[PDB]
Design a protein around this ligand. Structure first.
Ligand SMILES: Nc1ncnc2c1ncn2[C@@H]1O[C@H](COP(=O)(O)OP(=O)(O)O)[C@@H](O)[C@H]1O
Ligand SMILES: N[C@H](CCC[C@H](N)C(=O)O)C(=O)O
Ligand SMILES: [Mg+2]
Ligand SMILES: [Mg+2]
Ligand SMILES: [Mg+2]
Length: 508
């Protein structure tokens, strides 16, 4: 029954001032009161003394049906839409405001209520198809090494001043994010690094955030079950860099190693370009050197002409680009490469090319990639002379884009020496039919990959671990930091890191 995290003593705001700020109007004939509002939420179970409850239309349900409960829990006022109003007329003992489309103003209302936390610290937002999480963790580690106090908001969770924050949401709505930024400022955070997804930029979830710096990794095909076309997907991410958009960051740090990045740079507010593929850019990586199985040395060249010799403590060639972007973002908030370097060398990223070491003589790691494009990239990222043979173990989710299954098999069989097709959250589907589609795609490739099908994921991990010899690479893909195997409405624990470690201890 743990309610969502709020700042302990927010400045708050008068309801009348909030109504004037966003052109909300009273539901009825009574003028908006100067009632003190100390919080805002869209979830009645998170409502508490002093809150404005946002009662909004949603999936086959309207929050107005929960407004009486929110007020009973201590909310002192309600903000709703026209539909909600007709349903709240004279039913709750609290003032009600109506707005044409409240979802579009919740972020700015929460910014006011929580004291404009994005003006108390520097917010870095990072968007792009892949690399948001790794880049964010590298930035957080660089800030800590520089003796700054960082906050991190990402897919895995939230961390504040070096401490996990389990009471915060990983995918906050706009009011939740403002509350979390205020908590961070209260706890001494001077710089927040957060992932900003195309969903968030399309659904008003980062409205009201002043972004000091925006970063762009790359774009490839993804999220087309939400965006109608690639052009809509690009346009959503462009909202972080377009000077005409209210979400535009004050400085844009853009990787130009793909077509989308080059186009983003051309229209971006106050652009800084970054390239780890040899192209001309303000920041470039050069002189990349092998540094053992889980580290890579490189030189970051800054726009002033200074060469910084650095180490990123991650495997995978594309992590040079993520580290270079992290370095440029850190510079944009006043952290030098030398100050950040100890953090870049030691950072760990949960579920993103995350190695597990139990003393074996080969590289064994877990990665989140669960779609063909990301899987192709991570397999390519692990291709290098040091890499003997490469094995990948994965499956595909039930009740998730079935059209990707053959393609995942294809991309794996084009790149890996051993492809182990197993189960990964078959959910309400026939698990054997999912594996069959992946296997068919893998077999359609002309090459020399060995294709093995093992339904049980523990057995599949075990098979790959037993197969590996000195200098080989074993990749367990598709779950990353996410624990669980869901079948027919039941979920059993299954953490790929724990299961990989157990196989390594047993077999190695
Ligand atoms: N710069 C990159 N280019 C291509 N693929 C990447 C990059 N960074 C990470 N990946 C891969 O894509 C997936 C998502 O990586 P992550 O670092 O979580 O990105 P995001 O947070 O943008 O989803 C992982 O499975 C990883 O293998
Ligand atoms: N958590 C995300 C990714 C899961 C990826 C893969 N493990 C799967 O279950 O399809 C989801 O629910 O779509
Ligand atoms: Mg995504
Ligand atoms: Mg992510
Ligand atoms: Mg957690």
């Amino acid at each position: 029954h743990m309610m969502n995290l709020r700042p302990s003593d927010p400045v708050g705001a008068s309801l009348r001032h909030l109504a004037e700020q966003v052109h909300a109007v009273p539901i009825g004939s009574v003028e908006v009161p100067d009632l003190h509002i100390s919080g805002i939420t869209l979830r009645s179970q998170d409502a508490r003394r002093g809150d404005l409850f946002a009662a909004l239309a949603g999936a086959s349900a309207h929050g107005a049906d929960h407004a009486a409960d929110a007020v009973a829990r201590g909310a002192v006022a309600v903000l709703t839409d026209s539909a909600g109003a007709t349903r709240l007329d004279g039913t709750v003992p609290a003032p009600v405001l109506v707005h044409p489309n409240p979802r579009t103003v919740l972020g700015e209302l929460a910014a006011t209520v929580y004291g404009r936390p994005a003006d108390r610290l520097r917010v870095i937002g990072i968007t792009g198809t892949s690399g948001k999480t790794t880049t964010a963790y590298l930035v957080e580690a660089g800030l800590r090494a520089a003796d700054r106090v960082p906050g991190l908001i990402g897919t895995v969770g939230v961390r504040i001043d070096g401490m996990d924050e389990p009471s915060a949401l990983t995918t906050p709505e706009a009011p939740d994010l403002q509350a979390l930024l205020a908590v961070m400022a209260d706890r001494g955070v001077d710089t927040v690094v957060m992932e900003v997804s195309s969903h968030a930029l399309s659904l008003h979830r980062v409205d009201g955030v002043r972004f000091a710096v925006g970063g762009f990794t790359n774009l490839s095909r993804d999220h087309l079950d939400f965006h109608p076309t690639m052009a809509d997907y690009f346009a959503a991410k462009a909202r972080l860099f377009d000077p005409q958009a209210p979400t535009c960051a004050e400085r844009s740090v853009i990787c130009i190693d793909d077509e989308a990045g080059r186009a983003m740079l051309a229209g971006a507010h106050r652009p800084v370009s970054v390239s780890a593929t040899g192209q001309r850019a303000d920041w470039v990586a050069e002189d990349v050197r092998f540094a053992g199985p889980t580290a890579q040395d490189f030189t970051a060249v800054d726009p002033a002409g200074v060469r910084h010799r650095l180490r990123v403590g991650l495997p995978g060639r594309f992590n040079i680009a993520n580290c270079l972007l992290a370095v440029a973002l850190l510079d944009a908030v006043g952290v030098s490469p030398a100050q950040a370097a100890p953090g870049l060398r030691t950072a760990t990223v949960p579920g993103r090319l995350e190695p597990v070491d139990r003393g074996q003589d080969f590289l064994a790691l877990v990665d989140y990639a669960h779609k063909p494009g990301a899987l192709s990239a991570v397999l390519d990222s692990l291709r290098a002379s040091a890499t003997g043979r490469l094995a990948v173990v994965f499956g595909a989710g039930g009740n998730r884009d079935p059209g990707k299954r053959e393609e995942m098999g294809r991309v794996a069989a084009e790149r890996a020496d051993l492809v182990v097709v197993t189960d990964d959250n078959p959910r309400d589907e026939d698990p054997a039919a999912i594996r069959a589609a992946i296997v068919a795609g893998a077999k359609s490739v002309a090459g020399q990959a060995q294709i093995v099908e093992i339904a049980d994921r523990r057995e599949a991990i075990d098979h790959a671990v037993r197969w590996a010899g000195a200098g080989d690479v074993v990749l367990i893909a598709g779950k990353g930091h996410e624990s669980g195997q869901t079948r027919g409405g039941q979920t059993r624990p299954f953490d790929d890191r724990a299961e990989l470690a157990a196989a390594l201890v047993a077999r190695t």
